[PDB]
Design a protein around this nucleic acid. Structure first.
Lengths: 138, 135, 142, 30, 184, 230, 35, 48, 73, 141, 98, 243, 89, 53
RNA sequence: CCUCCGAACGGUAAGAGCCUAGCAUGUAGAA
């Protein structure tokens, strides 16, 4: 095939919402039906996780046309010397930051309330410049 | 009182404006503090003047476990709140724990004696294969 | 698109930046468009068009106007403004006015064919309503 | 009767009057 | 059903607008007496009538989860989904304060970030005292500006989890909102 | 080192030895690919999305999918919240409690989605500016080493307790390499690669099991299935 | 109390048909069809 | 994240082969892992 | 320091160490720590009886090992 | 397993349940080839003559007669159900499923006891009788 | 059985550790049998007063070769009088577990 | 059970007859086996009594259903309410009561453990100098807290266990729950709650007191627990069940 | 032809018969029986809240020639309601 | 623990059911809609069978 | 020094009786 604009899946997901609207009656079959493959998606998403030195990681996504499921169609290939060097720099940065920081504030759990619906990427995140990732000054 | 209500509303609006400005400028304040920390780590001193106390968020008290005492985790979720119930000694004995298990028979010195949910793992220091004369 | 590739855009960027900002605003407005009053597929129609229009804007600045540099063109490609595959299809003959990539994806249709809009108006029925379901165009053929 | 055939129009679930159990969730589609 | 969302309604925030109230509290509202007696067949005309009779704001109270009439009317409007400009007429009223706060809470649950800021920031200038019922059933004296501050800053207002507002400075750096010009 | 660190070293060494000893060469097989087959259909499209965005999409899809599984069986008294917690809306009768009894398939998928939601939510908190990069890494390190408390999948597949112990053992191994010198106790360690690997390898083996269980469950939802001798 | 001879013969026939672990020459599954 | 060792001599009686041998003999080296015995039904104190 | 099991039968089964002088509010805070639900969104029941936050654990006779049914608000 | 009468469609099952007003209709839902069903059917065959004054035993194949699978939750290999005057007679065996005997019974006398208890309790218009023995465990040791 | 075995040997029992552990195990198994007979749910504490109380006082009156402990929560009671309720207990102070 | 030991019973009938000793043993030790300390889990109330079953103990549920047959719980509550009404009636000139009335409560108010209304209402003649709440056995109590015109009496019955039978704490907890709540309804802010432990024959009372009320209720409850038709019926039924 | 649902302008007499005892014989009709009676529905319900559930139900409103559809009021209606209360007080 | 005694139970042949032998349960079963429907059906069946006979 | 903190089920009285739900559907043929 080819590549779709990134807004196609975003608006499909936004329109479908939480699958309670009347006009989306017919997608309740493929949505629930695709729960077999959901762990696979959960696997892929978790192996392409951004590293501490990455702010935003764009990954190829294979998404169902009805917005039922979204796989991360990628494998996190790294160059082993580069990967180990990056993580050693991460080790140095983290140890120095923990040494320097007078009062390290571990984040709270759960990050969001148990009654908060999952965030809209388009609204809350898409228009926000990210913070600085962990990086060693070379 | 209209005068008192206006004065209180003015005080609250000034406080809210100050809080909004502080919320906007706290990232810059923290960045300046980080730059000062970097300068101090660069050319101020080398572990001479502490100026540090390692302020923990919820500093619990971890007491000595008794022999064969059930492990207990205080909790993982709302630790960032500095609430006084989390600063307790959560290592205190419990249900099957006030008994001196050092006088029990070694067949009774187990966990969940008589239950079907049991394992071969005993406690810690017979799972440890290190000696104290080798190497 | 505030989120960019952690650098400065190449020379000639500010010349085309306001038009891209307007197109980005149009795209965002299309995303947030409520889907009540339209059919199920019509809500997806504007995005395609905007995307096509967006991809026209860079494609009419590097080939038919030569108004941007090569590095600027690749920067526009890498930032999601331009569609590499759509541009690659446009370079061909008979695909100059191609609306979207889905209308030529053969096996998306049931019979390994193209969209109805791909059919030229010459060999089309005279006066038939031509409303594509994938993107809603009146015939993206030559 | 043993050996007799079934009538054409007949639901042999509630043709006499009897209701199910629903013992649990993940056994049977409700 | 007395509690079904009207079948000429939108899908606010991607979900059924009634779902903007937590499900446990939604059910507790549905089984309350105020919802069955005083909140049946209500239109946006009669929501005003019930609103002018509100003596306090608040969410739920007591060991049992008992909704206040304020929260019941909020859920009733989420069900009816009155038009935006009806809600502006609700907010722009200056004589009955509880009607104004009811409209403000509906706007906070329903409106976008631009709408929320544009319509609720003018209410910082209202300092009228109000009754708010605690979780223990007691009544406290708050102010309208404090209620609006809770709407625009806190995650939970009237024991409702609010839809996540975009922070003000993000919209300010996007030019979509001019800075907050106070009365000072 | 304390006794816990020594036993952590020995247990990591034990599992390294067991992996090296039980290792058999991979078997020759035909190259089956799942996502290539999915992309070959008309029901799947491809795009390039932010990882946080696709993580939010996965969390929302898993929530919607479990919620559809619940609402299919007409369980209005049950509430699946967005942190993936099954909750009783009211006090449930025994007949309601027995009809609200799901198998380990549903609960294992629920808890895996809970862990994914926690991880993606930590990343979202990073992207919103609430939490910075160092605290994000510390949060991920905490999550992957405290799965026994943040989630509860150990009570529906208890063998994964083996993973949990490992994720604790690594936590010792890293910490006593990390908290040496000017660095004391308290949060701050963000070397989350160690536990992240362990949970990925857990998912590697659980994916076929969970997929089989959920396939059986969903087929059951739609009327489908997939002294001897005397 | 017990079925007549007709039903006994029929039941044994269907038991043989539905079990090749005890009968037949082709070693099929436990309770599947004729393999 | 690397070792200061330039030689494998540090892992004397601590490599994989040593651990396999200790597992096969129901013995644990100081710091080595403990396993269950391979041969159970032959009693090691039966030899009198 | 007594130990109370707060169980949700769907599944949230949690073990909480608490004092006898603790009110139900403090116990709810500890359950909040160990479950993730906010403490003011937790209901402690005895089959229909709702334990109230202002009453100490000793008054309710919630002894060491007793189970409390976990519901939500 | 093959001596007992067989019911070949749901109408015959309903008529067998209806045809008895003074005996307990005992129906085994399951497949004649199943090991558990054969074990249960040996016991039911050995007692079928002994209880003919107050019980009748029929067998049903849950593939050839599939109407009661969703209704009676017949998703176990063997299931034994008791009916008295067109009424399912629940029995509190102590296994948490008071509706059926979904295992194979190893004793001739225990099923006779269960059938007699069901009969005696159901004559008094009881929808649930209590089994004389608790089957919450197997008393192995 | 326990009294016959214990009065037959009387001195080899203390030296034989296998019998000493088997006595604990079998006493526990018989306690579990009664506990499961009472209820099809294994208890958590189940105080030993019901097993080791002489049959005259209503208990099962079994003999013990194990090492059963009585928690201090079991050796306490109360009585009603004219002046209210007074609380008593045997194991009053910082004593060893009985 | 002795007469039935030889009467030509079937095997199923004899098997159901060798369970009486186990039922009697379970009922004898019931305050310990059914405790919620042992058998951790949810509790279930028998729908005609205030007995909570911490675990399905079938050999005890039947012995408790037999003991509280013919609505004995409700009759015990009614008998105690009527006996308190009589004792408040004989003392209404010294106690300054203009009318003692028995409130038309729900028929099942006795075994409603989630909330309770008032059983008796006492109307003051002029006013009562009501003191702050305290236990019945508590002696020191100054009568200068507030003043009231109505005074409600509430009767609570519980079936205690070994782990939980401190009726004074139960009375304090119930009085602090019901009064400081928006679920129970009481005619006046001031009143008293009287709690009875039937399995241990204990009694206590927590709440507001007015001059002459505390000793009166002390003596009345001492005489009621010693002499009561319904309580006597319960005790005799337990005795017969235990042999 | 079903008219739209209309809000009840009358208060419900749920509390009216507290303490008022009703002696029930065989001959007594359901109208004077204990509890609440839907004269439109000819049904008896013995809770105040369950009676409210009934009079808020599909069948009760169907018997009144109504439906489960509420009128969509407009801007001027709400504004004039505001002015009406302003005038009244 | 002692001699169990069961409450009397009455069969309703109109409704093919079981109820309790006491004033309230029998009286409530008499005024049930199902009981009246069953009685009317029984009367109609009697008349129809007599006509067919 | 000893830190391994598990879970679900085996816990449904059986009836009567009246009311309202969630549900949860309802988009296909035709003259």
């Amino acid at each position: 095939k080819e590549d779709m604009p990134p807004e196609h899946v975003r608006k499909i997901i936004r329109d479908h919402g939480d699958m309670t609207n009347r006009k989306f009656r017919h997608d309740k079959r493929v949505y629930l039906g695709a729960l077999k493959y959901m762990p696979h998606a959960v696997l892929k998403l978790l192996e392409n996780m951004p590293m501490p030195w990455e702010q935003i990681r764009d990954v190829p996504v294979l998404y169902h046309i009805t917005g039922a499921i979204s796989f991360v169609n990628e494998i996190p290939w790294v160059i082993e010397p580069v990967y180990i060097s990056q993580w050693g720099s991460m080790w140095i940065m983290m140890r120095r930051e923990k040494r320097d920081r007078r009062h390290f504030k571990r984040m709270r759990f759960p990050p969001f309330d148990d009654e908060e619906p999952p965030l809209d990427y388009a609204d809350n995140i898409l228009d926000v410049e990210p913070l600085e990732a962990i990086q060693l000054e070379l | 009182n209209d005068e008192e209500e206006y004065e209180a509303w003015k005080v609250r609006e000034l406080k809210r404006i100050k809080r909004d400005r502080e919320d906007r400028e706290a990232l810059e304040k923290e960045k300046a503090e980080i730059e000062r920390m970097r300068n101090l780590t660069e050319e101020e001193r080398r572990a001479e003047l502490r100026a540090n106390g390692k302020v923990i968020t919820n500093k619990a008290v971890k007491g000595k476990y008794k022999f064969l005492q059930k492990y207990y985790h205080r909790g993982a979720f709302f630790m960032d709140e500095d609430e006084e119930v989390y600063k307790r000694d959560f290592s205190a004995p419990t249900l099957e724990d006030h008994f001196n298990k050092t006088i029990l028979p070694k067949v009774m010195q187990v966990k969940n004696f008589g239950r079907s949910g049991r394992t071969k793992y005993t406690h810690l220091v017979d799972q440890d294969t290190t000696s104290f004369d080798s190497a | 698109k505030v989120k960019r590739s952690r650098k400065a855009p190449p020379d000639g960027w500010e010349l085309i930046e306001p038009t891209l900002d307007e197109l980005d605003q149009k795209m965002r407005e299309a995303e947030t468009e409520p889907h009540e009053g339209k059919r199920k597929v019509e809500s997806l129609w504007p995005i395609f068009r905007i995307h096509h229009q967006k991809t026209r804007y860079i494609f009419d600045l590097f080939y038919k106007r030569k108004a941007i540099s090569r590095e600027l063109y690749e920067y526009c490609i890498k930032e999601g403004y331009a569609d590499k595959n759509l541009i690659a299809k446009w370079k061909k003959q008979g695909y100059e006015n191609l609306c979207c990539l889905r209308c030529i994806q053969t096996r998306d249709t049931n019979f390994g064919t193209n969209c109805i809009c791909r059919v030229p108006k010459s060999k089309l029925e005279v006066g038939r309503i031509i409303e594509c379901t994938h993107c809603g165009c009146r015939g993206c053929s030559g | 009767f043993l050996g007799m055939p079934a009538p054409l129009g007949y639901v042999p679930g509630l043709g006499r009057g009897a209701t199910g159990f629903t013992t649990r969730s993940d056994i049977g589609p409700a | 059903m007395a509690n079904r969302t009207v079948k000429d309604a939108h899908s606010i925030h991607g979900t059924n607008p009634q779902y903007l109230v937590e499900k446990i509290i939604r059910t507790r509202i549905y089984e309350s007496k105020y919802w069955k007696e005083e909140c049946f067949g209500l239109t946006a005309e009669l929501v005003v009538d019930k609103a002018m009779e509100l003596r306090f704001v608040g969410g739920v109270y007591g060991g049992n989860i008992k909704p206040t009439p304020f929260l019941c009317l909020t859920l009733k409007m989420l069900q009816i989904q009155p038009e935006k400009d009806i809600i502006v007429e609700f907010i722009k009223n200056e004589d009955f304060k509880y009607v104004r706060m009811l409209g403000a809470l509906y706007m906070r649950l329903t409106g976008t970030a631009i709408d929320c800021y544009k319509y609720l920031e003018p209410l910082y200038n209202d300092y009228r005292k109000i009754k708010s019922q605690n979780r223990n059933g007691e009544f406290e004296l708050m102010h309208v500006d404090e209620f609006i501050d809770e709407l625009l800053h806190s995650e939970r207002v009237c024991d409702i989890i609010l839809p996540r507002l975009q922070k003000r400075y993000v919209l300010e750096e996007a030019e979509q909102l001019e800075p907050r010009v106070s009365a000072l | 080192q304390p006794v816990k660190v020594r036993v952590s070293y020995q247990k990591l060494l034990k599992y390294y030895v067991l992996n090296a000893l039980k290792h058999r060469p991979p078997k020759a097989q035909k190259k089956r690919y799942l996502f290539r087959s999915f992309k070959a259909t008309k029901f799947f499209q491809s795009t390039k999305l932010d990882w946080v965005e696709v993580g939010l999409q996965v969390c929302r899809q898993g929530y919607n999918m479990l919620n559809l599984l619940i609402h299919r069986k007409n369980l209005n008294y049950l509430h699946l919240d967005y942190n993936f917690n099954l909750k009783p809306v009211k006090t449930l009768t025994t007949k309601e409690r027995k009809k609200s009894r799901f198998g380990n398939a549903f609960h294992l998928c629920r808890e895996v989605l809970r862990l994914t939601k926690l991880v993606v939510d930590s990343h979202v908190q990073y992207r919103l500016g609430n939490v910075d990069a160092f605290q994000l890494a510390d949060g991920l390190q905490y999550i992957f080493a405290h799965v026994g408390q943040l989630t509860g999948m150990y009570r529906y597949k208890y063998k994964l307790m083996r993973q949990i112990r490992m994720c604790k053992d690594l936590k010792h191994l890293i910490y006593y390499r990390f908290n040496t010198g000017p660095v004391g106790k308290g949060p701050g360690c963000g070397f989350w690669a160690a536990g992240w690997r362990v949970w990925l390898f857990f998912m590697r083996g659980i994916t076929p099991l969970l997929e089989r269980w959920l396939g059986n469950l969903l087929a059951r939802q739609f009327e489908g299935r997939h002294s001897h001798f005397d | 109390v017990y079925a007549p001879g007709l039903d006994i013969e029929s039941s044994l026939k269907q038991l043989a048909e539905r079990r090749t672990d005890i009968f037949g020459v082709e070693e099929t599954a436990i309770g599947k069809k004729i393999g | 994240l690397l070792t200061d060792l330039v030689d494998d001599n540090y892992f004397y009686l601590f490599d994989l082969k040593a651990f396999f041998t200790s597992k096969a003999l129901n013995m644990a080296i100081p710091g080595g892992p403990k396993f269950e015995p391979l041969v159970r039904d032959i009693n090691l104190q039966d030899e009198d | 320091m007594i130990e109370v099991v707060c169980n949700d039968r769907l599944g949230k089964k949690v073990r909480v160490k608490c004092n006898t002088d603790d009110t139900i509010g403090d116990l709810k805070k500890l359950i909040a720590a160990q479950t993730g639900t906010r403490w003011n969104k937790i209901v402690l029941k005895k089959w229909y009886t709702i334990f109230k936050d202002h009453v100490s654990l000793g008054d309710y006779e919630i002894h060491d090992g007793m189970n409390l049914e976990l519901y939500y608000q | 397993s093959y001596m007992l009468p067989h019911l070949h469609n749901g109408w015959q099952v309903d008529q067998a349940i209806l045809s008895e007003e003074d005996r307990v209709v005992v129906i085994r839902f399951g497949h004649d080839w199943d090991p558990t069903c054969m074990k249960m059917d040996e016991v039911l065959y050995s007692i079928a003559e002994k209880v003919k004054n107050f019980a009748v035993i029929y067998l049903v194949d849950i593939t050839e007669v599939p109407d009661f699978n969703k209704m009676y939750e017949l998703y176990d290999p063997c299931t034994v159900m008791f009916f008295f005057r067109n009424k399912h007679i629940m029995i509190d065996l102590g296994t948490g499923n008071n509706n059926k005997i979904n295992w194979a019974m190893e004793d001739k006398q225990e099923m006779v006891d269960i059938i007699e208890t069901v009969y005696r309790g159901a004559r008094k218009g009881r929808g649930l009788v209590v089994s004389p023995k608790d089957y919450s465990t197997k008393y192995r040791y | 059985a326990l009294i016959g075995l214990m009065t037959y040997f009387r001195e080899a029992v203390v030296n034989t550790q296998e019998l000493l552990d088997l006595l604990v195990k079998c006493e526990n198994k018989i306690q579990t049998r009664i506990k499961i007979g009472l209820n099809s749910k294994m208890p958590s504490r189940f105080p030993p007063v019901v097993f080791y109380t002489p049959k005259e006082l209503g208990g099962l009156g079994m003999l013990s070769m194990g090492h059963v402990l009585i928690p201090q929560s079991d050796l306490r009671w109360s009585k009603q009088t004219d002046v209210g309720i007074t609380h008593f207990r045997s194991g009053m102070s910082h004593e060893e577990d009985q | 059970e002795e007469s039935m030991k030889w009467k030509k019973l079937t095997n199923a009938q004899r098997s159901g007859l060798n369970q009486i000793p186990n039922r009697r043993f379970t009922l004898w030790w019931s305050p310990t086996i059914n405790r919620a300390n042992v058998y951790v889990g949810f509790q279930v109330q028998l729908d005609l009594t205030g007995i909570f079953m911490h675990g399905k103990i079938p050999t005890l549920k039947i012995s408790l259903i037999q003991i509280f047959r013919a609505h004995l719980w409700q009759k015990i509550h009614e008998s105690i309410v009527m006996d308190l009404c009589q004792v408040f009636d004989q003392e209404l000139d010294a106690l300054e009561i203009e009318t003692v009335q028995k409130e038309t409560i729900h028929p099942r108010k006795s075994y409603k453990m989630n909330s309770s209304c008032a059983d008796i209402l006492l109307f003051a003649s002029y006013k009562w100098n009501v003191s702050r709440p305290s236990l019945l056995a508590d002696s020191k109590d100054v009568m200068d807290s507030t003043t009231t015109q109505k005074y409600w009496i509430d009767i609570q019955l519980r079936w205690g266990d070994y782990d939980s039978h401190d009726i004074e704490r139960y009375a304090r907890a119930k009085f602090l729950d019901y009064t400081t709540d928006n679920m129970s309804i009481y005619p006046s802010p001031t009143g008293v709650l009287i709690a009875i432990d039937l399995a241990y024959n204990l009694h206590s009372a927590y709440g507001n007191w007015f001059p002459g009320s505390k000793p009166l209720i002390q003596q009345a409850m001492a005489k009621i627990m010693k002499a009561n038709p319904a309580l006597y019926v319960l005790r005799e039924r337990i005795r017969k069940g235990l042999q | 032809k079903r008219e739209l649902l209309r809000h009840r302008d009358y208060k419900v007499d749920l509390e009216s018969k507290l303490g008022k005892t009703i002696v029930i014989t065989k001959t007594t009709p359901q109208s004077e029986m204990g509890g609440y009676y839907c004269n439109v529905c000819d049904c008896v319900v013995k809770d105040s809240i369950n009676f409210l559930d009934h009079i808020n139900g599909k069948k009760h409103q169907r018997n009144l020639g109504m439906s489960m559809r509420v009128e969509r009021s407009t801007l001027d209606q709400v504004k004039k309601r505001f002015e009406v209360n302003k005038k009244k007080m | 623990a002692d001699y169990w005694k069961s409450q009397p139970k009455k069969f309703c042949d109109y409704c093919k059911c079981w109820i309790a032998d006491n004033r309230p349960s029998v009286e409530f079963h008499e005024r049930g809609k199902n009981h009246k429907e069953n009685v009317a059906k029984r009367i109609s069946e009697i008349k129809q069978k007599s006509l067919d006979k």
